[PDB]
Amino acid sequence: LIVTQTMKGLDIQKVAGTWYSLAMAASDISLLDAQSAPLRVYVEELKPTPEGDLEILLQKWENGECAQKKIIAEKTKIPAVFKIDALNENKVLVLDTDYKKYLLFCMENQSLACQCLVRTPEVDDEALEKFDKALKALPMHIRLSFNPTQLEEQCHI
Amino acid sequence: LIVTQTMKGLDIQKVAGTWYSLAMAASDISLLDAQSAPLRVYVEELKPTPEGDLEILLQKWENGECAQKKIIAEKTKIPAVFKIDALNENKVLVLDTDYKKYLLFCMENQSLACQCLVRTPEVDDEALEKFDKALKALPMHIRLSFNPTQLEEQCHI
Numbered sequence A, B: 001l002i003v004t005q006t007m008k009g010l011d012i013q014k015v016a017g018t019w020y021s022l023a024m025a026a027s028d029i030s031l032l033d034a035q036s037a038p039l040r041v042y043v044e045e046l047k048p049t050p051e052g053d054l055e056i057l058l059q060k061w062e063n064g065e066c067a068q069k070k071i072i073a074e075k076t077k078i079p080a081v082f083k084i085d086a087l088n089e090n091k092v093l094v095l096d097t098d099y100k101k102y103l104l105f106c107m108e109n110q111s112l113a114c115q116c117l118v119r120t121p122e123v124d125d126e127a128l129e130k131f132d133k134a135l136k137a138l139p140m141h142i143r144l145s146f147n148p149t150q151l152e153e154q155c156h157i
């Protein structure tokens, strides 16, 4: 592991709905620098299933255009940790959430990216503070932040 | 203005010599995101002149390659503020320095980029702390950081 913050008592059902990728950070600049960078992903919505897996809808710049993406995170024995089936299986960790305003999560394979998710297209200073505090314990080298205008655009244009 | 930290008592002669661009931050992502981004510049050396102007040597990715650059910052009535002659004249502000370990500066036209400069190819946590504290009073949206290996490479490859 690298991340050692996970949320206790996570009720996955309650993260359902609309999210905005307010800020992102990664351990390597190449993970986030270009518009087409591997982990430069913009969360649209989370749909927990009844079995407790997590369907994710997001946007990614790929074809020289903003593409829709539907991916599936499978549950593990840890309620705050999920697993996506890629070539090498990537781990998703929910560090913290209050369900109604913000959610903080990291993705790790080694390399790592984290995001601050918010419910509304607004700069939540407080959620950004939690994000930054969760991150000082991590070796990040690129950090991005978006404004309310960009949050309402496809791929944060 | 946007930046309202400048260093008091700056002795420009004493910033002469070798510097490393340890961290950079900008108000807009486009200023720093790509390798060829406008303000993605890597400081090599500062040469104050006897009149008190400041010659800057730096590296910039431009031709699909890492290019050498020699630019001149002209003094103003404020010891911590200098002016580069571009199409629109850009202002350079020295926020803080201890001459021997770190220097913090911002460039502003509106948009803005700041850097944490260090003498040695080492992660100075303390200088990075000062940088981050000087920045919370600013509206930055992209932040980059480099490791010791990259600091010894041309254009931080």
Ligand SMILES: CCCCCCCCCCCCOS(=O)(=O)O
Pocket (backbone or CB within 6 Å): A015, A038, A039, A041, A043, A046, A056, A060, A069, A071, A092, A094, A105, A107
């Ligand atoms: C509880 C938080 C939910 C996790 C948020 C989404 C993680 C997305 C991982 C994308 C990997 C790369 O995606 S790709 O389809 O473009 O290859």
Ligand SMILES: CCCCCCCCCCCCOS(=O)(=O)O
Pocket (backbone or CB within 6 Å): B015, B038, B039, B041, B043, B046, B056, B060, B069, B071, B092, B094, B105, B107
């Ligand atoms: C005391 C600190 C000294 C200031 C550091 C250098 C500022 C460089 C501004 C580059 C502008 C863009 O440069 S360009 O030549 O590529 O167009």
